[PDB]
Amino acid sequence: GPQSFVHFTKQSLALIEQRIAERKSKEPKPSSDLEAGKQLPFIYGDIPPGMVSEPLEDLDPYYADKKTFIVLNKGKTIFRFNATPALYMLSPFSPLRRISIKILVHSLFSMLIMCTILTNCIFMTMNNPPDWTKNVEYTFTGIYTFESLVKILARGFCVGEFTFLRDPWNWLDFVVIVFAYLTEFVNNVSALRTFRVLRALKTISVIPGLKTIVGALIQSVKKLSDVMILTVFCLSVFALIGLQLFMGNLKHKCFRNSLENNETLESIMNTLESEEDFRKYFYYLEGSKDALLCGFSTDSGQCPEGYTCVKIGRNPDYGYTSFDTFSWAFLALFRLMTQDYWENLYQQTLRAAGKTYMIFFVVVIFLGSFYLINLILAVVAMAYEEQNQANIEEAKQPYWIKFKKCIYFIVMDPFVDLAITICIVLNTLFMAMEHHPMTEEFKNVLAIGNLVFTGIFAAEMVLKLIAMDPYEYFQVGWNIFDSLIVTLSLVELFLLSVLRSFRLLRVFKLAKSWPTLNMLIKIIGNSVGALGNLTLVLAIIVFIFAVVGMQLFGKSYKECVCKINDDCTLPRWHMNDFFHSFLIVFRVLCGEWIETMWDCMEVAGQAMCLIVYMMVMVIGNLVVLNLFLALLLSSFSSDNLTAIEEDPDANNLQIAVTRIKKGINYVKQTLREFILKAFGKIWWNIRKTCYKIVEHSWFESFIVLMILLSSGALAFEDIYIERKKTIKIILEYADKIFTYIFILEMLLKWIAYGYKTYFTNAWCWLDFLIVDVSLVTLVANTLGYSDLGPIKSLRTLRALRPLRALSRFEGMRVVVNALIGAIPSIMNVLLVCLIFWLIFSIMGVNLFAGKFYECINTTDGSRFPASQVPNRSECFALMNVSQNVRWKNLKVNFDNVGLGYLSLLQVATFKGWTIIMYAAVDSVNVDKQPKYEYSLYMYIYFVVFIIFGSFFTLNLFIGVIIDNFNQQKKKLGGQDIFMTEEQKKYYNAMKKLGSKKPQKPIPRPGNKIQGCIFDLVTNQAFDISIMVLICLNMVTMMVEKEGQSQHMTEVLYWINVVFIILFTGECVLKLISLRHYYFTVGWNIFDFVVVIISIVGMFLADLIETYFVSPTLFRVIRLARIGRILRLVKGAKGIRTLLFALMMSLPALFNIGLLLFLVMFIYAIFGMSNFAYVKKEDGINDMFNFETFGNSMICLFQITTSAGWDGLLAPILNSKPPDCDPKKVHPGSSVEGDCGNPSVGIFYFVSYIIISFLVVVNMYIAVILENFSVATE
C-alpha cells in the first residue's frame, strides 16, 4: 500500500524504542526484494511529492525492531541508512545530515564523481608531467575528500550497521585518501604513484553494474582450486624430471683448442667480461648474443674444427633459460605449459642434450600443455553454465505524391536489392585489384570504377529518400548504416586511404541471406550489449595494468638501457611511456610474456618483474577466458529460442530469385513448346572363391603388413642414401614386388566384388588411384622416360602410399569419418573468415603497399640510417660505390591482397608478426627509406585486427565446429563419435570404477601382535604420517641444484636412503597386517610396485656409477624416485577425479593421435622429397631441417603446435638470385640449386597448420569436455 510511505519521525523513534525494550525482554530474514540498491516493488506505485529524498520509515517489517530508516531516490532506488546518531554526535534530525543525505542520493553527485575519476585517469597516463599538474592533483584530492566527507556525514563513519566503513569499497576510498594526504605531507615516489592507480578502481564502484561482474569473476575463480592444485602438482613433477635430466646441459659451449701463454680455461674465465672478450675464446654465431650450444652425444650440436665442447659460463637468455635449479626448471615448465616461445627452448635443449630427448617435450606438450588447458577451460565453462542457469531460474521466478508512388514502385522492387548486392560484390572484387607496382592506366581505371560505384550507391540513397520521407527512411538500422557509408564516400571524394576502405563495410549487407555471417554480427553485438560490462571491466583492468607497469618500470627502462640494447637506445618493446606499456600488456594477453620479461628483469629486478608479470598473466587471462566463453555460450545457446519465423516477409533477394526461377521455368516451357511445334555356371563359383579369398583374415593381415612395409620403406630416402648403395638396390626391387603385390589385390577385388560395387566406394577409389600412379611411374621408368619433366615430378606422389592404412585401421576410419561429417561447416566458417579478412587485407594493402623496401648492409643486415641514403636512388648510387648494399624487401608483406592474406595469417597466429609490425611502424612512403617508428600509431591497425579478426573469428569457428560434432553425436543416437565399437566396451567398463561402493573392511587377524599391527596400520594417523613423509621426500628432491657441494650430495643421498627404508617398512607392516588381502586394492599394489622399483633403481644407479661409466643411463635410472611422490594422488580427491577424466578420455585420444601421426608421416615424406636442399636460413639450420626423416619429424612436431612455422617457411620463399643460387653444386649428390618453391611451400605449411588447428585443438577440446562432464557428474 502507498500509505506505507510514512516519514521517520520522533514517534517512530519511540516505537522502535518500545520494540527494543521488548527485544531485550525476548532474551527470520530481511526481504530480498526490498534490499538497498534495488528498485521498489511495483506494489508501492508512485512516490508522493513530499516524500522523495526524505528519511522514510523503514518499509521492511524485518527491520521493525531496529533504528533503521529509508531514503528514496528519483529513479526509484532505495538507500538503507541508520538512525543511530552519526559520530555519536549528529542525530538523524539535523540540517547537516538532511543536506548530506540529499547530496549523496542525488544522481548529479554520482555523475560528477564518474567524470572526476575519468578525468584523473587521463592524467595518470603521463610518463613525466608538466610542473603545473600539482594544482590539478590538488583539485582531484579535494573532490575525493569532499565525496568521502559527504558519505561519512550521511551515514556515520563506523557506528554500527549501514555505516561508511561497512561497505568494502569505502575501505578502498578511505585508503586512497589517507595515502593521498600521507604522500603530500609525510611523503618510494614510484611506489606512491603506483598507489595513485588505486583511484581507477573507484570506477567499478561508481559505474552501475560492474560490482556484480567483479563478484561473479571472484565466485568463478573460487571454482578453480582443484584445477590449480593439479596444475601446480603436474608442473612440479615435470620440473623435477627436467631438473634430473637437463641439469647443467645448457652451460655447454665450444672453447678454443689451442691456448697461448700457458693459459687455461679457468684463467681465461677469471679475466673475461665483455662479449667482445668472450667472442675470442668461444664460438659465436654471427649476430648472436649467446655462445653456441654444443653437446657430447652423437646427435647433439657440433663444434667447428679447432673448438671443443666444455661446460662453463652462463646459461642462455641473460641466464634465465636453465634447468639448473628447481625454481628455474619450474619457470621453464610453466613456459612450456603456456607454450610461450617454447620452440626456442625446444631447440636449445635438443642441441645441448640430443635429438632423442624430444620424447620429453612430446609428453609434456601433449599431457600438460593441452590437457591442463582443456581442464581449465572446461571448469570455467561449467561455472558459467551453472551461473547462467541460476540467472535464468531467478528471472523465471499535390504533384509530390506522383513521384513518391512512382519511385516507391521503382526502388522497393525485389530485383533492385539483388542488383545492389551484385554491385556490392563487384565493388569489393574491384577494390581487391590493387598492388604495389601499379601502372598509371591501371590506377586510372581503378579510380574510374570506384567513382562509378559510389555514384550508383549515392543515386540509390537519393532514390530511396525521395521514394519515402526521412521520417521513415531513417527508421531502419541498415538505412542509417548505408547512409553513413555513402556520406563518408562523398567526403573522401570531395577531399584518404582509410576513408576509401570505409566503403568495405558494405559487405555486411549479405548477412541477411548468409546465416553463418549473421552469427559473427551477433557475437560482435553481444560483446557490446549483453556482455558490455565484461568488456568494460576488461578495458579497465588492461588500463590499470598498463599504467602500473609504466609507473614502476619507465625510469628503469631508460636508466638501464645499455643492459638490454647494445646501441644504448630504447628497444622495440619497453615501458617508458603509456602507449608502449599498453602494447606490452596487450602482447602478454595475446600470449607472449617471456621475451619482454627478460628485459624487464635485466633492467629492474627479478622479484618485481616476476610478481607484476604473473599477476598480469593470471588476472588478464582469467578475464579474457570469461569473456570468450560467455560470448561463445550465449551466442550459441541463448540465440536459439525460436523467436520469429524463418523469413516471414521473404527478403527482396529471395523474392527476386523466386521470380527468376519462375521466369526460367516459363522460358523453358515456352521454348519446349516452340521447338516441339517447329519439329557361365563356373564363372559364379570363380567369383565366390575370389570373394572368400579377399574377405579372409589371413589375406587382410598380409595386406596390412605389406602396407606398413611399403610405407616404412619411404623413410630411407634421405640425402644420405648415396652412402647406402646396397639399401638403394634393395629398396628399388622391393618397390616392384609391392606394386605386383597391390596390383594382384586390386584385380581379385575387381573380380570378387564387381566393377560397380568396387567403384562406388571411396576407399577402393583411393587405392585404385594410388596403384594407378605407381603403375604409371613403373611403366615410364621401364620405357626409359624416367626423367621426363612431369614424369619425374610424379615420383613425388609416392608419399601418398601411407594413405592406404586409413581404411585398414578402424580407429583412424572412425576419426576420419567425423572430419568428413564436419567438412561443410568448416567450409562455411572458412568462407566467412576469408570474406572478413578481405576487408583487413585491402585496408593493409592501401596502407602499406610497397613501403617495406629498405637499403640494408648485407654483411650486417642493418638498415642504413635515413640521414644517408634517404631513398632508393641514393641506395642505388651507394651500391654503385660499395658492393654489399641492397635495396631489399620483406618476403611476407602487403604488396597485394594475396600476400596480405599470408601476412594476416602470420599476425593472427602470432608467429612472425613482429617483423611485419616493425616494418609497418617504420614505413615512410614509396621509394623512401624507412625511419625508426616514423608511423608509430600503425600498431593500432594490428591491435584492431587481432581483436576483431583473431578473437571473434575463433569464437565463430569453435562454436560452429562444437555444434557440428554435437549434431553428429545426436544423429548417431548419443554414441561417442571418436571411439570404435571394441573400445566402447572398455569405456563402459572403466566408467564403473568411479562409483563402486567401499568394500567390507578386512577382518582382524588372529594373532595378538598381528592384531595390534592391524590397529596401528589401519589408522587415519598412519595415512596422514605417510602423506607428510612423502611431502618431506618431495622437498628433499626439490632442494637439489647444479654445482652443489659433495658434502650436500652425500647428505642428500643418506636422507633419501632413510626415506626408502621408511616406506619399505610401512609396506612390510601393511603386508604382515593385511595378510593376502593387501593386493585387492589398486593403490596398494601401486605402492608395492613403487617400493620395489625404488629399491632396484637405487641399487642399479649405484652400480652404474661405480663399476661402469654411463651418465645418461644414470640420469634416466634415477627417475624411479618420482614414483615415491606420485603417491600424493591417493589422498587428494580433488585431483583424483581429474586424472580419472584423463583416463576416461584416453581411448579417443589414441585414435586421434594415430591419425595425427599418419598425417605427420605423409607430410614428413613430402618435406624430405622437396625441401631437402633449401638454403640454411632462419629456422632451417644444421639440426632442424628436412634432410632426414628424424629432422623432418622434429620440425613437423614443432609446428604442430603452430610454432616457428614462419621461420621454417621463410627459407622456402626464396626463388631468384641473389636470394638463392639456382645452379649450386652439392657435394656427393646430383641435385643442383638451393632455391625453394614458393607455391608448394605456402600450400604445404598452411594446409599442415590448418590440419593441426582442426585436429590437435578441435578434436582434443571435444573429447576432454565430454569426459570431464562424465567424471564430475
Binding site: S556, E559, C560, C562, K563, C568, V603
Partner: protein, 119 residues
C-alpha cells in the same frame, strides 16, 4: 646520472672534513673505465684546480695548497667517491667539485660542495 652532495658543508677550524659525493649509476663501476675529476675553485666564477682523480688507481696530484692532507675516503665499487681532508685550515674554505663519468653510461654528472670553515 644522479649525484648527491651537500650544497654547504660547515666544518670547524682544525677539524677533518669528509666531502660526501655519491652517485647511483645502474651499471657496475668498471674500474678499467671509471673517470674521476675532483676540482677546487675559490669561487663559482673562479677557475678550477685539478687535484684528485681516478683513472685506474686513485691518483692524488698533491697540490701545494693541499699539501699531504688529501686522500681518498669513498669506494667506487659501492658508488661513494668522497674525499677526506685533515685539519681543515681557514684557507681551505671554497668550492669543491666532483665530476663522475661511469661508462657505459652516457650522461655526465657533477657534484658541488661549498666547504665552510667555522672558528
Amino acid at each position: 646520472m644522479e649525484v648527491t652532495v651537500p650544497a654547504t658543508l660547515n666544518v670547524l677550524n682544525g677539524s677533518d672534513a669528509r666531502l660526501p659525493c655519491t652517485f647511483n649509476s645502474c651499471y657496475t663501476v668498471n674500474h678499467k673505465q671509471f673517470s674521476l675529476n675532483w676540482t677546487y675553485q675559490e669561487c663559482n666564477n673562479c677557475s678550477e684546480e685539478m687535484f684528485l682523480q681516478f683513472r685506474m688507481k686513485i691518483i692524488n696530484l698533491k697540490l701545494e695548497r693541499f699539501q699531504d692532507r688529501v686522500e681518498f675516503s669513498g669506494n667506487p665499487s659501492k658508488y661513494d667517491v668522497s674525499v677526506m681532508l685533515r685539519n681543515v685550515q681557514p684557507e681551505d674554505e671554497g668550492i669543491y667539485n666532483c665530476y663522475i663519468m661511469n661508462p657505459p653510461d652516457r650522461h655526465r654528472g657533477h657534484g658541488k660542495i661549498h666547504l665552510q670553515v667555522l672558528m
